[PDB]
């Protein structure tokens, strides 16, 4: 469990790990935005 | 149904999932070197 001073920020900590997958998808989206030039 | 922990989960997930596409859309709106 988190320390009680930061226990309210648990949902952000839950979301945080999967963010590099979103970076990979962001690279794909950026290539989609330029038309895969 | 309405849980504040689940509500904050969805809010944080929405912000995370829409931050990057917001960056791309805003750079495309300013006509930057995308």
């Amino acid at each position: 469990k988190l320390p009680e001073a930061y226990a309210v920020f648990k949902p952000i900590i839950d979301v945080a790990p999967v963010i590099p997958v979103f970076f990979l998808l962001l690279a794909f989206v950026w290539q989609a935005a330029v038309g895969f030039r | 149904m309405f849980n504040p922990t689940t509500l904050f989960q969805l809010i944080a997930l929405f912000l995370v999932i829409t931050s990057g596409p917001a960056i791309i859309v805003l750079i495309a709106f300013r006509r930057g070197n995308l």
Binding site: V29, A32, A33, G35 | I17, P21
Partner: peptide
């Protein structure tokens, strides 16, 4: 009218949302 990359992104997010609800129903 709308650029196709936005449509593809929205469709991919909706497909992943369908996958997520199916997995949640598999776990519940």
């Amino acid at each position: 009218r709308i650029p196709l990359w936005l449509i593809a992104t929205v469709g991919g997010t909706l497909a992943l949302t369908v996958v997520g609800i199916f997995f949640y129903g598999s776990y519940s």
